[PDB]
Swiss-Prot record, chain A:
Component of the Integrator complex, composed of core subunits INTS1, INTS2, INTS3, INTS4, INTS5, INTS6, INTS7, INTS8, INTS9/RC74, INTS10, INTS11/CPSF3L, INTS12, INTS13, INTS14 and INTS15. The core complex associates with protein phosphatase 2A subunits PPP2CA and PPP2R1A, to form the Integrator-PP2A (INTAC) complex. This is Integrator complex subunit 8. It is linked to Neurodevelopmental disorder with cerebellar hypoplasia and spasticity: An autosomal recessive neurodevelopmental disorder characterized by global developmental delay, profound intellectual disability, seizures, absent speech, spasticity, facial and limb dysmorphism, and subtle structural brain abnormalities including cerebellar hypoplasia. Disulfide bonds: none annotated. It is found in: Nucleus; Chromosome. The WFEF motif is required for the recruitment of protein phosphatase 2A (PP2A) to transcription pause-release checkpoint. Belongs to the Integrator subunit 8 family. It comes from Homo sapiens. The gene is INTS8. It comes from the Eukaryota.
From Swiss-Prot, chain B:
The modification Phosphoserine is found at residue 96. This is Integrator complex subunit 5. Residues 78-100 are annotated as: Disordered. Component of the Integrator complex, composed of core subunits INTS1, INTS2, INTS3, INTS4, INTS5, INTS6, INTS7, INTS8, INTS9/RC74, INTS10, INTS11/CPSF3L, INTS12, INTS13, INTS14 and INTS15. The core complex associates with protein phosphatase 2A subunits PPP2CA and PPP2R1A, to form the Integrator-PP2A (INTAC) complex. Belongs to the Integrator subunit 5 family. It is found in: Nucleus; Cytoplasm; Nucleus membrane. Component of the integrator complex, a multiprotein complex that terminates RNA polymerase II (Pol II) transcription in the promoter-proximal region of genes. The chain holds residues 184 to 471 of 1019 of the full protein.
Length: 83, 288
């Protein structure tokens, strides 16, 4: 249900919708909302099924801004999974 | 009791020397003292000797013969009724909990002794939950370790506390919180009868007693879901079916109980979604 008047269940529903989201616009919106409502914590490690090869893993994490690296990591993982 | 203190000090020194150095200098005197105590039939003297031996000669080093002698003396003392003797020994062992009190109190391995130890641990846990002191965490951890070490029969001991946690209305919330903490700290040693107990009467009693608490006490739904997630190794299907029948089919005995069960189910689903598929990526997955 929407508007749970809480924080933990709200973040859980938001990350569940993010996992179930395919359109990159909705993904970006959910990720920026999570980054705005929470602390400077990473949101890319919310699914163990997103296996990114280690050849690009060392460079995908070398970004100062957390929002951009999280977005690019989620996009690359979802694109590889769809391929 | 003029020369008794010197004899007790000499016996304690001999026991400490036998525990440190494996010698035969305290094998005959200890046996003679145990025989005299058994022939005199004095539980208070045996309890005092055990307290004096466990006060300072229990955290030095591991004992082999002195520990066996102390266990034999404790068994000879507990052979009789010894109501007040055991009631005082429980408090004496709970006060001197540093640091080998668990290995010295639960070493009797007797039925009545284990029952008294479990009752004392439950009373201490209830007092710690009602007082919420600073050192309450150490006492709760010690009680949980003592309950986990004595895994002979804990179903009746848990049922006796679950039946009392629903009779009153004031201390019922504290008793339920202490029981939940003990179940979470003991890996849920008793979970098969967790759903068959509060069928119609105990469930309504707990729902009516929880209304007298505050928001900080009622916010334990997250802890309850975290405890239920890492539990139910062989009775998960029955508990899940009972929860789904009492939450969705509106088969609850009360009116507000269905909302609480729905919130608990939602919290459990959120915890399962955030812990099973949202834990991490580098380390291996968890075991639920």
């Amino acid at each position: 249900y929407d508007i749970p008047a809480s924080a933990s269940v709200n973040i859980g529903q938001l990350e569940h919708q993010l996992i179930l989201s395919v359109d990159p616009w909705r993904i970006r919106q959910i990720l920026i909302e999570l980054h705005g409502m929470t602390s400077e914590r990473q949101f890319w490690t919310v699914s163990n099924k997103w296996e990114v090869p280690s050849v690009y893993s060392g460079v995908i994490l070398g970004i100062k801004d957390n929002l951009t690296r999280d977005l690019v990591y989620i996009l690359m993982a979802k694109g590889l999974h769809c391929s | 009791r003029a020369t008794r203190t010197l004899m007790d000090i000499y016996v304690q020194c001999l026991s400490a020397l036998i525990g440190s150095c494996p010698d035969a200098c305290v094998d005959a005197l200890l046996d003679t003292s145990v025989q005299h105590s058994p022939h005199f039939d004095w539980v208070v003297a045996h309890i005092g000797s055990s307290f004096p031996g466990t006060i300072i000669s229990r955290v030095l080093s591991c004992g082999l013969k002195d520990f066996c002698v102390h266990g034999g003396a404790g068994g000879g003392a507990g052979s009789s009724g010894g109501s007040s003797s055991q009631t005082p020994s429980t408090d004496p062992f709970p006060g001197s909990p540093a640091i080998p009190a668990e290995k010295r109190v639960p070493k009797i391995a007797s039925v009545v002794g284990i029952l008294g130890h479990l009752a004392s641990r439950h009373g201490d846990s209830i007092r710690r939950e009602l007082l919420r002191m600073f050192h309450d965490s150490l006492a709760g951890g010690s009680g949980g370790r003592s309950g986990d070490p004595s895994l002979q029969a804990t179903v009746p001991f848990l049922l006796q506390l679950a039946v009392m946690s629903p009779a009153l209305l004031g201390t019922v919330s504290g008793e339920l919180v202490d029981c939940l903490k003990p179940p979470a700290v003991l890996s849920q040693l008793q979970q098969h009868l967790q759903g068959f107990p509060r069928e119609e009467l105990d469930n309504m009693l707990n729902l009516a007693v929880h209304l007298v608490s505050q928001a900080s006490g009622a916010g334990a739904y997250r802890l309850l879901q975290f405890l239920v997630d890492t539990a139910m190794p062989a009775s998960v299907i029955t508990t899940q079916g009972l929860a789904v029948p009492d939450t969705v089919r509106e088969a609850c005995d009360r009116l507000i109980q269905l909302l609480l069960l729905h919130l608990q189910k939602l919290v459990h689903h959120r915890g399962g979604s955030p812990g099973e598929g949202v834990l991490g990526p580098p380390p291996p997955p968890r075991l639920v």
